[PDB]
Amino acid sequence: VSSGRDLNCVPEIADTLGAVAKQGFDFLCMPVFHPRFKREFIQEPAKNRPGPQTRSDLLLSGRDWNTLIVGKLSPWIRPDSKVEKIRRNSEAAMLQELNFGAYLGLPAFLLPLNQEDNTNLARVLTNHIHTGHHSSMFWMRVPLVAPEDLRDDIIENAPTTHTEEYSGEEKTWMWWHNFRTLCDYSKRIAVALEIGADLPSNHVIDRWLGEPIKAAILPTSIFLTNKKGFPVLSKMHQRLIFRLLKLEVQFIITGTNHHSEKEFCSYLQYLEYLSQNRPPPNAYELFAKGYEDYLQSPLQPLMDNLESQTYEVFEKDPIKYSQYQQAIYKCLLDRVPEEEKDTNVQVLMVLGAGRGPLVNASLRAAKQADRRIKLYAVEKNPNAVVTLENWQFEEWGSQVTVVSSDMREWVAPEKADIIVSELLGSFADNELSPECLDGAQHFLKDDGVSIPGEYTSFLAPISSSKLYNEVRACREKDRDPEAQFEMPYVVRLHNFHQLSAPQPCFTFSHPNRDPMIDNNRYCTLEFPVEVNTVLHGFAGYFETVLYQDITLSIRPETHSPGMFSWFPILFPIKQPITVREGQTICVRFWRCSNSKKVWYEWAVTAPVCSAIHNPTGRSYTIGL
Amino acid sequence: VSSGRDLNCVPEIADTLGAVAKQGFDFLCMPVFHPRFKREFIQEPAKNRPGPQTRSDLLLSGRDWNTLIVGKLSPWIRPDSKVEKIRRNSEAAMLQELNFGAYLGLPAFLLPLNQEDNTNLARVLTNHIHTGHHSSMFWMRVPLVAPEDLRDDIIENAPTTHTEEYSGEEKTWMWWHNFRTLCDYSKRIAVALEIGADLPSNHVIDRWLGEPIKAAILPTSIFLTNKKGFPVLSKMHQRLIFRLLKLEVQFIITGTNHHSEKEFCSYLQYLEYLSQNRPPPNAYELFAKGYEDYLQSPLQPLMDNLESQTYEVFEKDPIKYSQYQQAIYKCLLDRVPEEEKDTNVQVLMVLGAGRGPLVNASLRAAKQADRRIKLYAVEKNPNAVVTLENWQFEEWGSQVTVVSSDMREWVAPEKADIIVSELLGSFADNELSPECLDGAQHFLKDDGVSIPGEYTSFLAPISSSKLYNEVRACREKDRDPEAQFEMPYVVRLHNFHQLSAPQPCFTFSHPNRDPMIDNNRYCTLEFPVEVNTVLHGFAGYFETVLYQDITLSIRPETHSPGMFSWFPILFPIKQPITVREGQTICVRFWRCSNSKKVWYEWAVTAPVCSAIHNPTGRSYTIGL
Amino acid sequence: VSSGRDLNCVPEIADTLGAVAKQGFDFLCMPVFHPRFKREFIQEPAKNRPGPQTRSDLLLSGRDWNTLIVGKLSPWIRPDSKVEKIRRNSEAAMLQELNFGAYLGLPAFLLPLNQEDNTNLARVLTNHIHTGHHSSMFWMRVPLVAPEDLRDDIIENAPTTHTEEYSGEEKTWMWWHNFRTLCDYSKRIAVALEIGADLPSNHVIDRWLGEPIKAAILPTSIFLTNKKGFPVLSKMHQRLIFRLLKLEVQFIITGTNHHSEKEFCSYLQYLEYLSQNRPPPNAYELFAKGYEDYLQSPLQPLMDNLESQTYEVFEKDPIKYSQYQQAIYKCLLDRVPEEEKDTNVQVLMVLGAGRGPLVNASLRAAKQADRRIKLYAVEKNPNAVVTLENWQFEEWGSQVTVVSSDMREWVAPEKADIIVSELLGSFADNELSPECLDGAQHFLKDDGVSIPGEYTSFLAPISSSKLYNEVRACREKDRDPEAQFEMPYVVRLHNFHQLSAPQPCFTFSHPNRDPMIDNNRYCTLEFPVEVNTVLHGFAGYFETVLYQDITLSIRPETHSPGMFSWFPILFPIKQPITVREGQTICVRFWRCSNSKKVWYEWAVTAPVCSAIHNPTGRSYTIGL
Ligand SMILES: Nc1ncnc2c1ncn2[C@@H]1O[C@H](C[C@@H](N)CC[C@H](N)C(=O)O)[C@@H](O)[C@H]1O
Ligand SMILES: Nc1ncnc2c1ncn2[C@@H]1O[C@H](C[C@@H](N)CC[C@H](N)C(=O)O)[C@@H](O)[C@H]1O
Ligand SMILES: Nc1ncnc2c1ncn2[C@@H]1O[C@H](C[C@@H](N)CC[C@H](N)C(=O)O)[C@@H](O)[C@H]1O
C-alpha cells in the first residue's frame, strides 16, 4: 500500500526524511516554507526582511524532490480573508509557495478547503495552472465532516445542532464541487479526503463516489486501542479503507503518536495489515485490471474488418461459447425427436462465423444432442475466411461449407432450420445485429429458429467527475470541438456512482415476423433519484435470450458469471446536470437510420433540458 | 545489432522461423501469400478459384506475427503496368495483401521501388493508410544502383553506358523522392536501402543522408571471400556499414549461401563482428544519446523562471565554467599589477547568477590570479535567489552580496570593473543577452570589461526529410495550422545533411559604445551548393569570445571539446525547396523587436522564394 | 470607365481635387507626405525637426479620403538600399506613411516595384498588414518593360542589348512574383501595371494574364498625335486597353500634358471613347456577368433534392432542350418507318424527369417526327414529383405515367425503346450519370437506345493567382486545414490563363454492353507548355453525344452556341508549381468508388510531383 507521513514540523529535512523512510513510508507531506514565517510583500520595513526566504533546494537530490515530497501551503495563507491586507499578502504568498514547488519539481502540493468560500483561492490556483505545463498535482484537503460540525458540545450558550440536516451534513462535498467548477474541472486538481473519528451517515460518504480521490488522510486520533495496546480502526472505518483501496488511493498518516507505549510505525503496520487482508479480486476484476475508466471506441465489425488479435480476445471467453453450445444443444432436441435422430439432418447457418468458435460450438452441441447437422459458415471478413477455409480443409471436412459473403447479399442454396450469430455490442444492437439478421431472415425455414431469439438494452444514470474529464480530453483537431460528448464509449466504469436502477431501453426479436419492419426506436425513461448529485452520463448494458432459459447478460444485477466479452457502454452529456434528492431524471433515446448509417440520439428533459446529442449522426454513426 | 533474414521460399512457417532464429536472426521477411500464386479478381472461371487464398494466421502466435515477421508484396503485383487487366488485378491483390498484413498485426511490410513510375503503387498505398490507424511500417525496397545500371556488358548490340551521368547515377533517389511526395511524407513510409556489389560514387550514397532509412539490405552476393573461406566485405562496404550503424538501421541478409563450405550464419557472424568493432562514441555522443532529432522549445530564462533541475543540468558542464574561470583569471591579471595586488579590490558583478556556479568560478579565478575581488550576484528568479542566499550565508560570507533584481531595473551602489554573464542561447542572442546587458551597461566603469565581450551566430542550410516530418507533426489545436514551421527548435540534429558551410549571421559586442544602439538586424546569406538535394531548413550555431583567446563554440568546425550545454537550433521552412548542384541557396534573416518582444523573421529568396516566416512574431516571440 | 489622375505635385489638396474632378476623373493618386521631404529618425539634430510632419487630415472629409484618394509612397524611401542608414530611415518612413494612410482610411496605396530585390520592402509591408485589419489595398506599381530595358541607345561605351532574351524580357513579372510569394499571396496586394511607349512581345504581356491587376497606368508620353492634334493610341495599345477593360481594371493617367494645344481632359476623353466603343458582350457573357471567378460547390442531384429555383434556372436554357428534342426526333425516325407510323408505339423513359422539360421535349419530338410514343417520367425527388403529377393531370394525360422512384430501384412494367436523361455535371460523370444509367440499363430493350449515347470529360492546366487565393480563403473551422484544395469547384473562370490545349480525360458509353462493368478510371495526361508560368490547377469541361451528330459541349473550342447550363469545373492543387517554357505538365486523375461514394483523386508528376489530392475521398465525395 502507498503511504505518506504528514508533518508540520521539519527541523532538518534529511534527518526527518530518513526517520520517515525508516518507519516504512513512501513519501513525506511537509511545509516548503516555515509554517509560522508570515511574510509581508507591500509594507516597509517588514517587506525588506533579509533572506533566505526558506531552505535550499540543494538539501535534497532532484529525484528526492520529484518522488518523496508532497508540498504544503502555509497555514496563515488566507486568500478569501475579509481583511484586504491579509488577502493581498496571501495571494502573493500562495503564488510564491506554488512557484517554489514548481521550481522543486514536486509531484503534488496540498491546499486546504476548510470553509465554504474559496473563490479567490480557486482564482489564484487557476492563474498558477495557466503559467506553464508542470503536470504536477494539486491535492485539495477536504474533510468528510466540517470542523464546525464535529466540535464538542461544551459551549453552554452556543449548543451544537442536534437536528438532522440531510443537505447540510453534505456541506464539504459542496465546498469541493464549487472549487472544481470555478477551476473548470482541471485534471491537475484532485481530492485528499480527511477521515474523522465519527464517520458521517452513508449518504454523506458515497457523495464522494465518482470524485477524483487521490489521497485519504487518517489522523492518529481516530484510531482505537486494542487489548495489546496497539492502534486499530472500528469495523466501519475498516469498510471505508477497503472501498478506498479499490480506488487505489494514497494513504496519509497525520498527527502525533497517541499510542506512546508503541512505536509510531504501528499506525502504518495496521494499515499494511488491512491492505494484505483485503477481500480478493474475482476473474473479471483480474481481467479488467488496467482497463478501469479507460475509454475505447466501440468496435464496428460490419463496417471494419477485425484484426486476428481481436478475434483471439473474443475466443478467450469460454462462458459465452458454452452458453451458445447449450442453447444449440437444447434447440436440436426440440426440433428432432429420438425416432428421427439418424434420418433428420438439421441445416445450421453460423452468420458471422469469424475464425470459427461458433462453428465448433454447433458441432459439439450436435454431438452432445446425438443429432445430425449440416453447417454453413458465413463470413464477410476475407481475412477471417482464410482461417475458416484452412480449418474446413484440415479438420471440419464436407460437413461445413465456408461462405465468403455478407449475410444480407448471400443467395443460399438451402433454407436453414437454425441460424446462429454473435453480432451483439455492449448496447446489444449497436453492431447492427437487427439489420444483418433482417437481411438473412429470408433463408430461414418458416418454423426456423434464430439464436439469439431476442435482446434488450438497458440504461442507468451515472455520476462520475473523472469520466466527464476523460471524455472532455477527447477533443480533436479538425472536427467539431464538442464531438467527443456526442458519441458512446466502451469503458470498464470504475470511479463512478450509479444514480438509479437500470431500465430497459430497446428490444429486438428474431425472426422479425412483422409486415412493417422498422428498426428505428424512441424511448422515454424516468429514473427516480434518492441522493443529491451531478449527472455526467448514462451507462448502457444488455441482456439476450439465446434459447429459452439460456441467456447472456452484462446488466449488473443479472451479469453472466465470469463472462468478460463486453464492458459497459457510456453515453456522455455535454453539460453536467445538478440533481436533488427526490427528483426524477428523465432521458429520451432514439435509434435512427438511413440506407447507409445507423445512430443514436439522446437528450435529458428532466430536472432540466440538455441539447439533443448527436443530431443526424453528425458526430457518431454506425456504417451499414 | 538488429538483424533479419529475407526469404522468398517458406515451405513450413514454424520450421523456417525456427531455423532462422537458430542462425541468430531477430526477424524474418517473407511472403504472406505464395509469391507464384497469381490471383484473378474479375474474369471467370479463375476468379472463382476455391480457397484458402493463403496459409492460416493460427500457424503463429499473435506475439510472433507482431514481432518476428516482416511481410512482403507478391512479385507479380504490378500496379503501374501498361496492361489494364494486370493493373486492376494488381490493385485488388495489393489491397488484399496489405489488408492481410494489417489483420496479422505485422510490424512492417516490404514494397519495391524497382522502376521510375510508381504513381499507382503510391495511390493504392495512400488509400490503404487512410483506412484505419495501424501504426505499422511500410519499407520501400530501393537499391543504391538501379538493376539496368548494374547489368553485365554482355549484349553485343546494346552496350552499357560508359559515360558519367551525375544526375542519372542518382536516379533511385528520385524514385524514392517522387513516391514519398505523392504519399505526402507519411511517417509510416520509410526506406529499406539495397546495397550492391559495386558501391556507387560518394555523391550517389550521401543523397540518402537525411532520408528515413529504417533497413539496409545486404545480398550474400556482395560478400568477398577471405583466406579462411568466410564471407567478408570490402573496406568501402565496411565504411558504409559503420555510417548505417550510426543511424541504428535494421540489417537484412538476402540471397542464397554463396560460401557453401561454411554455415549460412557466417554472414550474420561477420556483421555482428563489425557491430562489436565499431569506433567508440565520445562524451558528447554519450550525453546526446536519446536526444537524436528530438525537437525541443528553446528555453526563455528571461520570460520564465527556470526549474531547479534545469540549473542542475547546466551545472553538469565543467568545460563551460573552467572557460569562464580562465577568462576571469586572465582579465584580473590585466587590470591589477603585482604591486597593487594587496590594495586594489576589483568589483565583479555576476549578472544572472542562477544557483551560483559563475560566482564560484569568479572566486576560484581570483584565488588563482592572487587578486582581491568584491562580488555582486544579481538574479531575477526568486527561487534561484533561495539557493543563492543560503550559499551566501553558509559559505560565501560578506565578500558576496546577493541581489534579487532584474539587471535592467537594478540601482547599483558601486560601479563594476568586470560584469560576468551567461545569457546565451543556441543562436547566441535568442535568450536576449544583448537587451539584458544593454540595460546593465550603465553600472560598468568607463574602462570596465564585459565577459562575454562578443558573440556571433552562424547558419547552415540542411536537408532532412525526418526533421521536416517531425516539425510537421507539431501542429496544434487552437492555433494557426502552420505555426510549427514559423518557430525555432533546439535539437540534437542526427538524421540530416549539411548542404553548405556555416556562415556568420548576427554579431553583438559588450559594452555597446555606440550612440545609435539598435539590436535589430537584417542579414543576407549566400550558400553555394555542390549536390542535388531538398532544403528543409537552417541549422543555427554560435561562437563567443569570453576574454581574448578564451572562447566557447558550438559551430561544428570550432566546437569546444566536451561541452554539451547547447545543442544546435533548427529554423524550418513551410515548404521543401528543390536545389540543383551548382546552385546558390540565398536566405534572409531579420532580428526584430518592440518594447515587449524580440523575434526572428526569415525567408529563402534563391533558387526560389519562400514566404516570409514568422512575420510580426505571429507564431514565435521572445518575451522582454 | 473608372479613372484616376496620378500627380506628384499637390500645392493645395482642395484646389487640386477640384481641378481633377472637373477633368472627369473618379480619383487622385497623390503623395500623403511631400515627396522631397526626407525625414531623419535616429541622428540629431535632424531627427528633432519641428512639425507638422505633413498636412492635416482635416483638409478633406472622411468620405473624400475613403473614396477619392489613392496614397503614394515617397520616392526617396529605399528599404532595400545597400546603405544601412538609408535602409533604417526608409523602414521607419515606410511604416509612418502606411500608418498615415490607414489613419486617413485610404481605399488604396501605391508602392513601386522598380528593381529585382524588394525583400525588405515585402517584409515591412507584411508587418504593416499583420497590424490590424484595414481591408485597404496595396497597388504594386510594376512596368511591363523595366526602365533599364527601355533606355535610349545614346551611351557610346555602354550599348543596349540588341540580343533577344526570352526570359529576361519577362523580368518585371519575376519582380512581382517574388514580392507576392514573400508576402504569402495576401488578398490585399494587387498589381498597378505601367504601360510603356513600345509594348513588349506578346509572351511578355500575357505573362500577366491570371495576375490580380487592379489598375493600368497610362503615361501621357505613350500617346501619339492624330491629324486634328488630339492624343490617341496605336492599334496594339487599343487591343491591350480592350483586354484590360474585360478585367474591369481602374485606369490611371500619369505625366504632364504633351498635347499643349489641347485641354488635358483629352487623354481621358479618348480613353472614355475606347470604353464606349468596345466590342459588345454575347448572351453567355451577359448571363455569366456577376459570376466571374466566383467559386461554387458542384450540385449533387442524386444525394440532394434540388430546390424549385435550381430547376427554374436549368429550364432557362432553350438550346439544351432543343438539342434533346432534335436527338429524340432523329432516333424516332430511325426506329419506326412511315408504314409503321400509325401502329408502332415507341416506349420512352425520361430518367430523372425533374419538373418535366425533357418530357415536353420528347412530346414535341414525337409530334415533329409524326410518330407515336408512350412516356414514363421517373423522378426520385418527391418535391419535383408534385410538379410532375400536377402537369400530368392538367396537361399530359394518360400518355405520361409519372413514377416516383430511384431509377436503380424501379421495377418497370414494360421495356424501353429509348431512355432519355440529363444527369451530367460540368465534368460530365461527376453527378454519377454512369451509376444511375447502369442501374436502369436492364429495362431497356436489347436494340434499345440511350440518349445520351456517350460523354467525355476534358482537362486543361491553368494559371491563376486570383483563383488560387479564392480557393485558399475557403478554409473552414472543424475540418482539415487544406480540405478546400482537395475538392472541385464549379466556376465561371475569368482572370486566368489556359496553359495547354484541353485533352480527353474519362469516357462513358450507354448502354454499357461489357461483362466486366467498372466505372473506375485512371488517366495520365501530358500537357506541352510553351511559356514560363505557375500551375495553380486544372480546368475541366465535357462533351456529349445525344444522338449521332446531335451534341452538347462546354469544351471551349467546340462550345455549344448560347448554352449556359454548365460553367467549367476547377480542380485546384495545394501548392503552386513553377513551369518553364518547353516543359511538359504531367497530371494523373483517378475516378474511384465504393458501394456508398464516388470521388476523384489527382496528382501532378511532372515537372515536379505534388501530393496525391483527395486520397480515399477524405475531403470530397459524391454520394450514391
Ligand atoms: N452482415 C454480415 N455478414 C457477414 N458477416 C458479418 C456481417 N456483419 C458482421 N459479420 C461478421 O460477424 C463477426 C462478429 C464477431 N464480433 C464475432 C465473431 C465470432 N462469431 C465469435 O463469436 O468469436 C465478424 O467476424 C464480422 O466480420
Ligand atoms: N535581466 C535579467 N536580470 C537578472 N537575471 C537574469 C536576467 N535575464 C536572465 N537572468 C537569469 O540569468 C540566468 C541564465 C542561466 N541560463 C544561467 C545560470 C547560471 N549563470 C549558469 O551558468 O548556470 C537565469 O538564472 C535567469 O533567471
Ligand atoms: N437515380 C436517380 N433516379 C431518379 N431520378 C434521379 C436519379 N439521379 C438523379 N435524378 C434526378 O434527375 C434530375 C437531374 C436534373 N439535374 C435535370 C432535371 C431535368 N431533367 C432537366 O433537364 O431540367 C433531378 O431532378 C434528380 O433528382
mmCIF file with all atom_site columns, N, CA, C and O in Angstrom, chain B residues 129-149:
data_model
loop_
_atom_site.group_PDB
_atom_site.id
_atom_site.type_symbol
_atom_site.label_atom_id
_atom_site.label_alt_id
_atom_site.label_comp_id
_atom_site.label_asym_id
_atom_site.label_entity_id
_atom_site.label_seq_id
_atom_site.pdbx_PDB_ins_code
_atom_site.Cartn_x
_atom_site.Cartn_y
_atom_site.Cartn_z
_atom_site.occupancy
_atom_site.B_iso_or_equiv
_atom_site.pdbx_formal_charge
_atom_site.auth_seq_id
_atom_site.auth_comp_id
_atom_site.auth_asym_id
_atom_site.auth_atom_id
_atom_site.pdbx_PDB_model_num
ATOM 1  N N  . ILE B 1 129 ? -3.354 3.369  -46.166 1.00 0.00 ? 129 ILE B N  1
ATOM 2  C CA . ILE B 1 129 ? -3.007 4.142  -44.970 1.00 0.00 ? 129 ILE B CA 1
ATOM 3  C C  . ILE B 1 129 ? -4.230 4.908  -44.398 1.00 0.00 ? 129 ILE B C  1
ATOM 4  O O  . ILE B 1 129 ? -4.453 4.860  -43.187 1.00 0.00 ? 129 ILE B O  1
ATOM 5  N N  . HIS B 1 130 ? -5.070 5.505  -45.267 1.00 0.00 ? 130 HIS B N  1
ATOM 6  C CA . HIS B 1 130 ? -6.243 6.267  -44.851 1.00 0.00 ? 130 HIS B CA 1
ATOM 7  C C  . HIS B 1 130 ? -7.478 5.401  -44.573 1.00 0.00 ? 130 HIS B C  1
ATOM 8  O O  . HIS B 1 130 ? -8.597 5.914  -44.535 1.00 0.00 ? 130 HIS B O  1
ATOM 9  N N  . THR B 1 131 ? -7.255 4.107  -44.289 1.00 0.00 ? 131 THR B N  1
ATOM 10 C CA . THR B 1 131 ? -8.271 3.122  -43.906 1.00 0.00 ? 131 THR B CA 1
ATOM 11 C C  . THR B 1 131 ? -7.850 2.530  -42.526 1.00 0.00 ? 131 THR B C  1
ATOM 12 O O  . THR B 1 131 ? -7.209 1.475  -42.484 1.00 0.00 ? 131 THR B O  1
ATOM 13 N N  . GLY B 1 132 ? -8.164 3.256  -41.437 1.00 0.00 ? 132 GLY B N  1
ATOM 14 C CA . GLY B 1 132 ? -7.819 2.903  -40.054 1.00 0.00 ? 132 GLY B CA 1
ATOM 15 C C  . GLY B 1 132 ? -6.665 3.719  -39.477 1.00 0.00 ? 132 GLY B C  1
ATOM 16 O O  . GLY B 1 132 ? -6.480 4.876  -39.869 1.00 0.00 ? 132 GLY B O  1
ATOM 17 N N  . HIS B 1 133 ? -5.870 3.123  -38.538 1.00 0.00 ? 133 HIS B N  1
ATOM 18 C CA . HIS B 1 133 ? -4.683 3.747  -37.899 1.00 0.00 ? 133 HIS B CA 1
ATOM 19 C C  . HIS B 1 133 ? -3.380 2.939  -38.109 1.00 0.00 ? 133 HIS B C  1
ATOM 20 O O  . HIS B 1 133 ? -2.376 3.477  -38.586 1.00 0.00 ? 133 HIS B O  1
ATOM 21 N N  . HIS B 1 134 ? -3.415 1.662  -37.683 1.00 0.00 ? 134 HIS B N  1
ATOM 22 C CA . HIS B 1 134 ? -2.427 0.579  -37.739 1.00 0.00 ? 134 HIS B CA 1
ATOM 23 C C  . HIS B 1 134 ? -1.042 0.866  -37.129 1.00 0.00 ? 134 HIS B C  1
ATOM 24 O O  . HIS B 1 134 ? -0.523 -0.030 -36.434 1.00 0.00 ? 134 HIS B O  1
ATOM 25 N N  . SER B 1 135 ? -0.437 2.069  -37.391 1.00 0.00 ? 135 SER B N  1
ATOM 26 C CA . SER B 1 135 ? 0.890  2.500  -36.894 1.00 0.00 ? 135 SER B CA 1
ATOM 27 C C  . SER B 1 135 ? 2.056  1.709  -37.580 1.00 0.00 ? 135 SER B C  1
ATOM 28 O O  . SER B 1 135 ? 3.212  2.153  -37.557 1.00 0.00 ? 135 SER B O  1
ATOM 29 N N  . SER B 1 136 ? 1.708  0.546  -38.184 1.00 0.00 ? 136 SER B N  1
ATOM 30 C CA . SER B 1 136 ? 2.515  -0.398 -38.967 1.00 0.00 ? 136 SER B CA 1
ATOM 31 C C  . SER B 1 136 ? 3.420  0.316  -40.023 1.00 0.00 ? 136 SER B C  1
ATOM 32 O O  . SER B 1 136 ? 2.963  1.240  -40.690 1.00 0.00 ? 136 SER B O  1
ATOM 33 N N  . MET B 1 137 ? 4.666  -0.142 -40.194 1.00 0.00 ? 137 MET B N  1
ATOM 34 C CA . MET B 1 137 ? 5.585  0.490  -41.154 1.00 0.00 ? 137 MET B CA 1
ATOM 35 C C  . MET B 1 137 ? 5.562  -0.093 -42.562 1.00 0.00 ? 137 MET B C  1
ATOM 36 O O  . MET B 1 137 ? 5.351  -1.287 -42.753 1.00 0.00 ? 137 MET B O  1
ATOM 37 N N  . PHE B 1 138 ? 5.819  0.761  -43.547 1.00 0.00 ? 138 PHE B N  1
ATOM 38 C CA . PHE B 1 138 ? 5.952  0.361  -44.934 1.00 0.00 ? 138 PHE B CA 1
ATOM 39 C C  . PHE B 1 138 ? 7.381  0.652  -45.330 1.00 0.00 ? 138 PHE B C  1
ATOM 40 O O  . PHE B 1 138 ? 7.794  1.817  -45.331 1.00 0.00 ? 138 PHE B O  1
ATOM 41 N N  . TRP B 1 139 ? 8.157  -0.426 -45.600 1.00 0.00 ? 139 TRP B N  1
ATOM 42 C CA . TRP B 1 139 ? 9.559  -0.337 -46.002 1.00 0.00 ? 139 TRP B CA 1
ATOM 43 C C  . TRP B 1 139 ? 9.667  -0.431 -47.509 1.00 0.00 ? 139 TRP B C  1
ATOM 44 O O  . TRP B 1 139 ? 9.381  -1.487 -48.088 1.00 0.00 ? 139 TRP B O  1
ATOM 45 N N  . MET B 1 140 ? 10.065 0.680  -48.141 1.00 0.00 ? 140 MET B N  1
ATOM 46 C CA . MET B 1 140 ? 10.236 0.774  -49.585 1.00 0.00 ? 140 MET B CA 1
ATOM 47 C C  . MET B 1 140 ? 11.627 0.304  -49.985 1.00 0.00 ? 140 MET B C  1
ATOM 48 O O  . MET B 1 140 ? 12.612 0.957  -49.653 1.00 0.00 ? 140 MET B O  1
ATOM 49 N N  . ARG B 1 141 ? 11.684 -0.857 -50.669 1.00 0.00 ? 141 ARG B N  1
ATOM 50 C CA . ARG B 1 141 ? 12.887 -1.556 -51.114 1.00 0.00 ? 141 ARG B CA 1
ATOM 51 C C  . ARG B 1 141 ? 13.430 -0.865 -52.352 1.00 0.00 ? 141 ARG B C  1
ATOM 52 O O  . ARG B 1 141 ? 12.864 -0.972 -53.439 1.00 0.00 ? 141 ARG B O  1
ATOM 53 N N  . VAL B 1 142 ? 14.486 -0.080 -52.160 1.00 0.00 ? 142 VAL B N  1
ATOM 54 C CA . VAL B 1 142 ? 15.064 0.709  -53.238 1.00 0.00 ? 142 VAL B CA 1
ATOM 55 C C  . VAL B 1 142 ? 16.574 0.493  -53.284 1.00 0.00 ? 142 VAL B C  1
ATOM 56 O O  . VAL B 1 142 ? 17.244 0.536  -52.249 1.00 0.00 ? 142 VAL B O  1
ATOM 57 N N  . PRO B 1 143 ? 17.147 0.192  -54.454 1.00 0.00 ? 143 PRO B N  1
ATOM 58 C CA . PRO B 1 143 ? 18.600 -0.021 -54.480 1.00 0.00 ? 143 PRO B CA 1
ATOM 59 C C  . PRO B 1 143 ? 19.390 1.279  -54.612 1.00 0.00 ? 143 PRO B C  1
ATOM 60 O O  . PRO B 1 143 ? 18.866 2.249  -55.143 1.00 0.00 ? 143 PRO B O  1
ATOM 61 N N  . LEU B 1 144 ? 20.667 1.285  -54.159 1.00 0.00 ? 144 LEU B N  1
ATOM 62 C CA . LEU B 1 144 ? 21.577 2.412  -54.389 1.00 0.00 ? 144 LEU B CA 1
ATOM 63 C C  . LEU B 1 144 ? 21.766 2.567  -55.905 1.00 0.00 ? 144 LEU B C  1
ATOM 64 O O  . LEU B 1 144 ? 21.772 3.679  -56.427 1.00 0.00 ? 144 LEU B O  1
ATOM 65 N N  . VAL B 1 145 ? 21.946 1.428  -56.601 1.00 0.00 ? 145 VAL B N  1
ATOM 66 C CA . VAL B 1 145 ? 22.175 1.378  -58.054 1.00 0.00 ? 145 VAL B CA 1
ATOM 67 C C  . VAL B 1 145 ? 21.040 0.589  -58.684 1.00 0.00 ? 145 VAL B C  1
ATOM 68 O O  . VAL B 1 145 ? 20.810 -0.540 -58.277 1.00 0.00 ? 145 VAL B O  1
ATOM 69 N N  . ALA B 1 146 ? 20.336 1.188  -59.662 1.00 0.00 ? 146 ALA B N  1
ATOM 70 C CA . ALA B 1 146 ? 19.229 0.573  -60.415 1.00 0.00 ? 146 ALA B CA 1
ATOM 71 C C  . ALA B 1 146 ? 19.698 -0.705 -61.146 1.00 0.00 ? 146 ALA B C  1
ATOM 72 O O  . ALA B 1 146 ? 20.853 -0.728 -61.598 1.00 0.00 ? 146 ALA B O  1
ATOM 73 N N  . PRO B 1 147 ? 18.846 -1.771 -61.265 1.00 0.00 ? 147 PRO B N  1
ATOM 74 C CA . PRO B 1 147 ? 19.293 -3.009 -61.964 1.00 0.00 ? 147 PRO B CA 1
ATOM 75 C C  . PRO B 1 147 ? 19.740 -2.818 -63.424 1.00 0.00 ? 147 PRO B C  1
ATOM 76 O O  . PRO B 1 147 ? 20.652 -3.521 -63.864 1.00 0.00 ? 147 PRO B O  1
ATOM 77 N N  . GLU B 1 148 ? 19.130 -1.857 -64.153 1.00 0.00 ? 148 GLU B N  1
ATOM 78 C CA . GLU B 1 148 ? 19.523 -1.502 -65.527 1.00 0.00 ? 148 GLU B CA 1
ATOM 79 C C  . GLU B 1 148 ? 20.966 -0.931 -65.555 1.00 0.00 ? 148 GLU B C  1
ATOM 80 O O  . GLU B 1 148 ? 21.675 -1.084 -66.558 1.00 0.00 ? 148 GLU B O  1
ATOM 81 N N  . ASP B 1 149 ? 21.396 -0.304 -64.435 1.00 0.00 ? 149 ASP B N  1
ATOM 82 C CA . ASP B 1 149 ? 22.699 0.331  -64.314 1.00 0.00 ? 149 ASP B CA 1
ATOM 83 C C  . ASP B 1 149 ? 23.793 -0.589 -63.795 1.00 0.00 ? 149 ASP B C  1
ATOM 84 O O  . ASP B 1 149 ? 24.951 -0.186 -63.813 1.00 0.00 ? 149 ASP B O  1
#
